[PDB]
Symmetry: C4
Subunit: 388 residues, 4 copies
C-alpha cells in the first residue's frame, strides 16, 4: 500500500453523531477491565481502535488502589477494538510508558511511549511494532507528549513534545518522523507561551494542533504544522469563547498572542476544528471542574477575537464527569472530505469521587454529520455505590 | 467479490433442524456474559454470526439491575461467533444505539443503529465498519427499525423504519441503501395499518417482510419489497392462524387488509415464510404471554383467509419463556435454493421472572430441512434460583 | 487446495511421546472453563484442535450441578486450540447436539451433531461450517455416532452410526459423505454383534475403526472400511488381550467372530492401531472401572487369537481416573508415513467422585515415536477438595 | 519466505530502553493469569512474543499451592502477545514439558519441550507446530535445556542440552536441528566444566551462548557455536566481574578456563553480549540472592581477566526480586545491525515470599539504544498482602 496524503478538506459540520462508546467502568464492575486514563482513538486503513494508558491492573483488582497516580512503571499504551472495553484479554500493548502518541502513515503505525523518572525520562519510537528510535529528555522535567493521535502526510509524522515546567516556561519541540526515524526537530516558535498535550488533525495539506496552556492561559494554544516543509507556527485561539478548564467566564474580547488570565497552573487536554465558518470548539460545560462537555460552532474562532457561538451541541451533561478530549479522523474512509471526529474521556473515581480508591475512565466518541441531528447526552453510566 | 443477487427460491420446508443455540444465561451465571435483548442472526459470505443489543453490563454485574429498560446510552449492537455466548471479550461492537438492523450485500456489511432521546433520536448508517449516512427523526417519537437482519439485492438494501405512536397511526418509511448511502425513501403504502420490527428475507428477486402491528392487529402486517424498482406493497397475513402476541383465539376467517381485533397496544416481533404451499408461520404457543414457540405449515397463509395448519413443529414448550423471533438466511451457502432459517429470543428475568432485577436472553436458532425430522424442544435452560 | 488422499502407511511405533494436555479441570477451578465430556482431537491441514461435547456451563457455574447427564439441549460440539482448556471465550461451536464426529477432507471440515429426544433424534451434517444434510433416526432409540474424528479419502468421509438398543441387537449404519452430501449408506455387515463409538484412522488406502461392544463383548469390534468402493467388513480383535471396560481377565484364547463373554450391558469408547507386527492396543489398566491407561504392543492382535504383549507403555496410573479414548492422525504432516496418535479422556467428578455434583474431564494426548522413549504417567492433576 | 541468515553485527550499545513488561502478578491478582516461571522472549519475522513454562493453574486458583515445584505433568511451554499477561484465554501452547527452548528460522518456528520423570525424561522437537523428532535421556538425570530462545542460521538451529548431575560433571550436548530434524549432535568440548541454561544470540555468522555453571563456578561458561561447520568451543568469561548468583565478591583477576570458586551447587540463568569493546554483562545486584539487576559495560570481558566496568545501568533495584535472565534479538527488524535485547524474570512468591503458597513471575524486557538514555528501575509491582 501507500503513504496517506492529506488531500482533502473537512466535511461540513452541522452536528455530531455517536461513533463509539465502551462503557468500560460499567462493564469493569464485574469483568477484568483494565484501569486506564488519557484515552484516545486512532485509525488504521482497515480498522479504527481505542487507545489509552493502562495502569497495569483491573478496576476490581486491589492494585487499582492509588491509580490517580500519573506515572509508574506499570503503565503502558494499549489499544483495543472500537467500543469494546479495555480488558486484560482483548488489549494489545503498543509500548511501555506514561505519556504517548500513535498514528498510522498508511503503510504502518508509529507509536511513541515515554517512560522513566521525572528527571531522566525517555521516549521510544516504535514503527511497524518494532522499536526504531529513542529520544532522551532535554530538560529533565517530565518529558511528555500529546496523549492523542498524531497525523501523517506522505510518511512524515509530526509530534509535539514538551520538557520542562508545568507552571512556567518549558522547552517544547516539534519532531518530524518518517518510518520511526527522526528527520528533523524544531524548537517551538510563535506566540504560544506554554504547550501541553496537543490534539491534532490533518487537512489539505497541513496539520492543526489544539493544545493546553498549563501556565497562565485559559484560551488554547494552536500549533499549525506544515508537514512538507517541516515547519510550524503558534498562537492562541483568538475567540473569547475560552475552552480550557478550569477557566474564567467568557469575555467579549479574546487573546490571539498571549494567555487569557484568571487561572494559573492548571488545564485540561482539549481540541478544536478550525475551519473558517466550519469551526467547532470543544470544552467542558463547567468552568471550574472536569464535568460536562459541549461542542460550539464559533465562526473564525482562530482569528476573530470577538467571535461567539452561533450553534452548539451538548455531549455530556454538566452533572456528569468528563475529562480529556482530543481529535482524530479516519483518513482512509470513502468520500471527498475528512469527517471530523473526537472523543471525550469520562473520568470516574478520584479525585472527584473518593469513596473508591481508584481512578479510571470510559470513552465516548463522536463524528460530524452534514445533517442537523438531534442531540443526546452521553454519561459514563457507572454507579459508584456498586464499587463499594 | 460481488454483490449478492437474490437468484434462488426457498428450499422445500418439511421440517426444521437445530442450527444454533448459545446458552447465554446458563453460561452467564458464572462468566462475563453481556446482558442483551432483541437478538438476531446474520451471515457474511464466509461466516454467520449472532447479533443483539447489549445493555452495557454483564448479567452478574450489579449494573444489570434495571435492564428491563429498552433505551439507554449504554446499549449497542454487538455481534459474536455462532452459538457462542455474547461475552465482554468475544463481542464485536457494530454501532451504538437501542434499535438496529444489519446485513451483508456480498461485498461489505451495512449496520444501522438508532440512538437518542425519544423526541430526537437519529439513525447512523455504517458500511464497511465506517459511518456513512445519518437519518434524523421525522416524527420525534422513538425512531425505530427492524431488530433483525435486512436483505440486499445487487447492492440495494431496503430497511423498514417507523417513527411515531406505538398505539396509533405512525410514520413508516422504507429506505433503500447502497453502500450505506441513501438511494431513495418511501412512505408506507398499502393496507397495513401499523408497522413495527419487520422480519425480512429475500427470494428471487423480491424481499418479504413480516412485521408487528402494535396498534389494533393480532394478525401480522406484510411488506413486500421490490429491490430493483425500489417499490413496495403492504397488507396483512389473510390467514385466521393469527401469529402476534398477545392475540385472540384463531377464528375461521382472517383479515387481509385490516387488523384482526381483540388485543390493542401490544405485540411481539415475529416472522413468516410466505411461499405458496411452502408457507410456514411462526408464533408463540400462548395467546397471552411470550411463552412457547411453534412453526405451523399453513398453505397460502398470505392470501387465503380460511387457511389452517396441515403440519407443524414445536420449537419451545409453552412452559418455557420465548420472546422475539425473526428470519434470516445464508445467501452464500451452496445449493440451488435458499434454506429458510429463524431464531427465537428466549427472554429470562423481568417482567415474568422478577426474583431477579435484570432482563436478558439467550438464542435458539433453526433452519429448514427437506427431510421430515423428529422434533425436540429448546428451552433457555437456566435456573433462576442460581441467580438469587 | 486438494482432497487429502490416504497414500501412506503408519510409522513404526516403538513408543509414545506427549503431544497434548490441557489441564482443564485444574485451570477450570478458577477460570471460566466449560464442562465437557466425550472429547477428541482432529487436525486441519494447518492446525490441530481439541474437540468435546460441552454441557453449556462452566465447572464453577452452578449449572454444572447434574452434568453426569448424557443428553440435553444445552450440549454442543466445541473445538478449541491444542492443549488450551475449553473456555467460554476461546471455544468455537461446530454444531448443536450430544453425540458427534468431525473430520477435514483436505478442503473443508465436516462436522456432524445428533440432537433430539431418545425416540426422535436427528443428525445434522455440517460442511464448511454450513448445514448441508440431515438424517432422521431410523430405529427411534438414541441415534448416536463415533465421539471421535472420522477419516476422509479423496473427499469421501465414512461415518459409523448406531440406532437401537444399547443392551441388545441394534441397527448400525456406515454412511459415506462427500462435502456433507450423502453418497451412500450401508447396513452393518460382518461378524461384529454390537457397534458403538468407533475410533477410526486411515492408512493406504483403507480406514480402520475400533469400536465398542456394549452388549455382550469385552473384546472390541473392528470395522474396516474401503472408502473408494464404499464397502466394509467387521469382526472382533482376535487377541486374548481384551481391551474394553469393564472386562474379564485376559484368557489365552480370544474370539474373532463373537463377543468374549463375562461383562454385559457396558463398555467404554476405545481404540487400536492394527498394523501387523506394528500393532498397538490401548486399554484401561483396571478391568472394573475407568481408571488407568496403557498401550500394549500386540503383534497381529487383529488376526491372532493367541497373541500377547511383547512391549508396552503406561499412559495413566491405575490410581488415576481415565475414560474414553480414541484415535486421530495429522494427515497433513511432513514425512513418508502417518504418525499414530490418540487421546485419553480423564473423567473427573461423578459417578466416581460424588463429593462434587458435576462431571467433566481434561485431555491427555500422545503420538508415536520411532525412538524408544522413557515413559511418564499423565494424570488430570486436579484436587477435588479444592472444588468443595 | 527464506531462512534467516546471521549477516549483521550487533548495534552499538550505549544504553538500554524499555521494550516489554507484562505486569502479570499485578494483573493476575484479579484476572485468570497463568502461574509461570522460566520465561523468555522470541521473535517471528512478523511478531515478537513472550514465552514461559506454565504451571497449569492461575495464580488465584487453589492449584497454585505448591508451584515452587520445578517439574510436573501440568507444565507446558506457552507463548502470548508482547507485554500482555499470560492468561488462560490468550495463551498459545507450544508443547508439553518443564524445560524448553524455541526459535524461528525465518520460515517456521522450532519448539522443544522436555517432559518425563527424572530418570526417563525425553525431548520432543516441534517444527511448524508439529512434532518431528524425539530425543531420549542419555544420562537419566533430568534432561534439560536452555529456558530461552535458540538461534538459527540458514535453517540450522543449535540447541544446548545437559543431562546428568547438577552438582558435578554432567553430559552436555550441542544439537543441530534443521526443520526439526537432527542433523548432528556433539559432546561438549572446551574448558567449561559445567553447563546449564544457555542464553544465546547470533551475530555474523556465529552464535554466542552464555550459560550457568551450577557446580563450582560463579563466572559464566561461554559456548561459541559455528552453525555452518556445526562446531563449537567453550570457556568462561575471563572477567573478574562475576555474573552468576549466588557469587563471591569481584576479585581483580578472573578465570578463563576454570570455575571461579566460592559458591558451590547453585547458580542462576543469565546472559551476556560479548562484542569486544561493545561488551555488556548482566547480573543480579545482590551476590547472595536473586534480587536486583544491572547491566555493566565491560570491554573484552570474554578475554580480559582484568577487565572492569566503565559504564552501567540499573534495571531492577536490589530491593526488588529478580530471577532468570536471557538474551534474544529481533533478527527481522530493519537496519544494518542487530539490536541486542534481554529479559529479566521477576520472581514473586516462594521461597523468598512464603506468606503465599505459590511461585510465579512477571517479565521486564529491554533492548539497546545507540543513545545515552536515562535509566529507570523496573520492579514487578505487585503487593503481596493483596494475595493473602
Ligand atoms: C433536538 O436536537 C437539536 C439539535 O441538537 C436541538 O437544537 C439545538 O439546541 C441547542 C440548545 O438550545 C442549540 O445549542 C445552542 O446554540 C446557541 C446558539 O444558537 C442561538 O444563537 C445563534 C446566534 O445568534 C446571534 O447571532 C445571530 C447572527 O445572525 C443573530 O441572529 C442573533 O440575534 C444573535 O445575535 C442564533 O443564530 C440561533 O438561532 C438559530 O437556531 C435556533 C435553534 O437554536 C433556531 O430556532 C433559529 O431559527 C436559528 O436558526 C440561536 O438563537 C448557543 O449560544 C448555545 O450555547 C450557549 O448556551 C449553553 C447553555 O445552553 C452554554 O453551555 C454555552 O456554552 C453557550 O453559552 C455560553 O457562552 C456564550 C458565549 O461565550 C455566553 O454569552 C453565555 O452567557 C454562556 O456563557 C456562560 O456559560 C458557559 C458554559 O459554562 C461558561 O463557560 C461562561 O463563562 C458563562 O458562564 C447552545 O450551544 C443548538 O444550536 C440547536 N441545534 C439546532 C440544529 O437547532 C433541539 O433543541 C432538540 N430538540 C428537543 C425537543 O430537545
Ligand atoms: C417425532 O417428530 C415428528 C416430526 O415433528 C412428530 O410428528 C409431528 O407431530 C406434531 C404434533 O402432533 C405435528 O404437528 C401438528 O400438526 C397438526 C396438523 O396435522 C394434522 O392435520 C393435518 C390437516 O388435516 C386437515 O386437512 C386435511 C386435508 O387433506 C384432512 O386430511 C384432515 O382431515 C383435516 O381436515 C393432517 O393432514 C395431518 O395428517 C398427517 O399428519 C399425521 C401426523 O401428524 C399423519 O399421521 C397423517 O397420516 C397425515 O400424513 C394431521 O392430522 C397441527 O394442526 C398441529 O397444530 C395444532 O395443534 C397444536 C397443539 O399440539 C397447537 O399448538 C397449534 O397451534 C395447532 O392448534 C391450534 O390451531 C388450530 C388452527 O387455528 C386450531 O383449530 C386449534 O384448536 C388450535 O388452536 C388453539 O391453540 C392455539 C395455540 O395456542 C391458540 O393460538 C388458539 O387460539 C387455540 O387456543 C400440530 O402442529 C407434526 O405435523 C408432526 N410431523 C410429522 C412429520 O408427522 C412425531 O410426533 C414425533 N414422534 C414422537 C414419538 O414424539
Ligand atoms: C523408562 O522408560 C522405558 C520405556 O517405557 C521403560 O521400559 C518399559 O517398561 C515397561 C514396564 O516394565 C514395559 O512394558 C511392559 O512390557 C511387557 C512385555 O515386555 C516383556 O515381555 C516381552 C515378551 O516376552 C515373551 O515373548 C518373548 C518372545 O521372544 C520371549 O522372549 C519371552 O520369554 C516371553 O515369552 C519380552 O520380549 C520383553 O523383553 C524385552 O524388553 C525388556 C524390557 O522390558 C528388555 O529388558 C529385554 O531385554 C527385551 O528387549 C519383556 O520381558 C508387558 O508384558 C507388560 O504389560 C503387562 O504388565 C503390566 C503390568 O506392568 C500390565 O498392566 C499389562 O496389561 C500386561 O500384563 C497383563 O497382560 C498379560 C497378557 O494378557 C497377562 O499375562 C498379565 O498377567 C497381565 O494381566 C493382568 O493385568 C491386566 C491389566 O489390568 C488385566 O487386564 C488382566 O486381566 C490381568 O489382571 C508391560 O507393558 C516396556 O515394554 C518397557 N519398554 C522398553 C523400551 O524397555 C523403563 O522401565 C523406564 N525406566 C525406568 C528406570 O523406569
Ligand atoms: C540518568 O541516567 C543516566 C544514564 O543511565 C545516569 O548515568 C549513569 O549513572 C550510573 C550510576 O552512577 C552509571 O553506572 C555506573 O558506572 C560506573 C562506571 O562509570 C565510572 O567509571 C568509569 C571507569 O573508570 C575507570 O576507568 C577509566 C579509564 O579511562 C578512568 O578514567 C577512571 O579513573 C577509572 O580508572 C569512568 O569512565 C566513568 O566516567 C564516565 O562516566 C561518568 C558518569 O558516570 C561521567 O561523569 C564521566 O565524565 C565519564 O564520562 C565513571 O566514573 C560503574 O562502575 C558502576 O557500577 C558499579 O557500581 C554499582 C553501584 O552503583 C554496582 O552495582 C556495580 O556492580 C559496580 O560496582 C561493583 O563492581 C566493581 C567492579 O567489579 C567493584 O569495584 C565495586 O566495588 C562494586 O563491587 C561491589 O558491588 C557488586 C554489586 O553487588 C558486587 O557484586 C561486588 O562483589 C561488590 O560487592 C555503575 O554501573 C552509568 O554509567 C551512568 N551512565 C551515563 C551515560 O552517564 C544518570 O545518573 C541519571 N541521572 C540522574 C539525575 O539520576
Ligand atoms: C506526563 C504526565 O504526567 N501528564 C499528566 C498531565 C501533566 O501532569 C500536566 O499536563 C502537567 O504538566 O496532567 C494530567 C491531568 O489529569 O490533568 C494527566 C497526565 N498523566 C499522564 N500523561 N500519565
Ligand atoms: C425502540 C424500542 O424501544 N423498541 C421496543 C419495542 C417498542 O417498545 C414497541 O415496539 C412499541 O413501539 O418493544 C419491545 C418489547 O419487549 O415488546 C423491545 C424494543 N426495545 C428495543 N428495540 N430496545
Ligand atoms: C529442569 C529443571 O528443573 N531446571 C531448574 C533448574 C535446575 O534445577 C538447576 O539448573 C539445577 O540443574 O533450576 C531452577 C532455579 O530456580 O534455579 C529452575 C528450573 N526449572 C525448570 N526448568 N522447570
Ligand atoms: Ca490553563
Ligand atoms: Ca398486536
Ligand atoms: Ca462391553
Ligand atoms: Ca554457580
Amino acid at each position: 500500500r501507500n503513504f496517506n496524503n492529506l488531500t482533502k478538506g473537512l466535511c461540513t459540520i452541522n452536528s455530531w453523531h455517536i461513533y463509539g462508546k465502551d462503557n468500560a467502568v460499567r462493564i469493569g464492575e464485574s469483568s477484568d477491565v483494565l484501569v486506564t486514563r488519557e484515552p484516545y482513538v486512532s485509525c488504521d486503513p482497515d480498522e479504527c481502535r481505542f487507545y489509552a494508558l493502562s495502569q497495569g491492573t483491573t478496576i476490581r483488582g486491589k492494585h487499582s488502589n492509588g491509580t490517580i497516580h500519573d506515572r509508574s512503571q506499570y503503565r503502558a499504551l494499549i489499544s483495543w477494538p472500537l467500543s469494546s472495553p479495555p480488558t486484560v484479554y482483548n488489549s494489545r500493548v503498543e509500548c511501555i510508558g506514561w505519556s504517548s502518541t500513535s498514528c498510522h502513515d498508511g503503510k504502518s503505525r508509529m507509536s511513541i511511549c515515554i517512560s522513566g523518572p521525572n528527571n531522566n525520562a525517555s521516549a521510544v519510537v516504535w514503527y511497524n511494532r518494532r522499536p526504531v528510535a529513542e529520544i532522551n529528555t532535554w530538560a529533565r522535567n517530565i518529558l511528555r507528549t500529546q496523549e492523542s493521535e498524531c497525523v501523517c502526510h506522505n510518511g512524515v509524522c509530526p509530534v509535539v513534545f514538551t520538557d520542562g515546567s508545568a507552571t512556567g516556561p518549558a522547552d517544547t519541540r516539534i519532531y518530524y518522523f518518517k518510518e520511526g526515524k527522526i528527520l528533523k526537530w524544531e524548537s517551538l516558535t510563535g506566540t504560544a507561551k506554554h504547550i501541553e498535550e496537543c490534539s491534532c488533525y490533518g487537512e489539505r495539506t497541513g496539520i492543526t494542533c489544539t493544545c493546553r496552556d498549563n501556565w497562565q492561559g485559559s484560551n488554547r494554544p494552536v500549533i499549525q504544522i506544515d508537514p512538507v516543509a517541516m515547519t510550524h507556527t503558534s498562537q492562541y485561539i483568538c475567540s473569547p469563547v475560552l475552552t480550557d478548564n478550569p477557566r474564567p467566564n467568557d469575555p467579549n474580547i479574546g487573546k490571539c498572542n498571549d494567555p487569557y488570565p484568571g487561572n494559573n497552573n492548571n488545564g485540561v487536554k482539549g481540541f478544536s476544528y478550525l475551519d473558517g465558518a466550519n469551526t467547532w470548539l470543544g470544552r467542558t460545560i463547567s468552568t471550574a471542574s472536569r464535568s460536562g462537555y459541549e461542542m460550539l460552532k464559533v465562526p473564525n474562532a482562530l482569528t476573530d477575537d470577538r467571535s461567539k457561538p452561533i450553534q452548539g451541541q451538548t455531549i455530556v451533561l454538566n452533572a456528569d464527569w468528563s475529562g480529556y478530549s482530543g481529535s482524530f479522523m479516519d483518513y482512509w474512509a470513502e468520500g471527498d472530505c475528512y469527517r471530523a471526529c473526537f472523543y471525550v474521556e469520562l473520568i470516574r473515581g478520584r479525585p472527584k469521587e473518593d469513596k473508591v480508591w481508584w481512578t479510571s475512565n470510559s470513552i465516548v466518541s463522536m463524528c460530524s454529520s452534514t445533517e442537523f441531528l438531534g442531540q443526546w447526552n452521553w454519561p459514563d453510566g457507572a454507579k459508584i455505590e456498586y464499587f463499594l
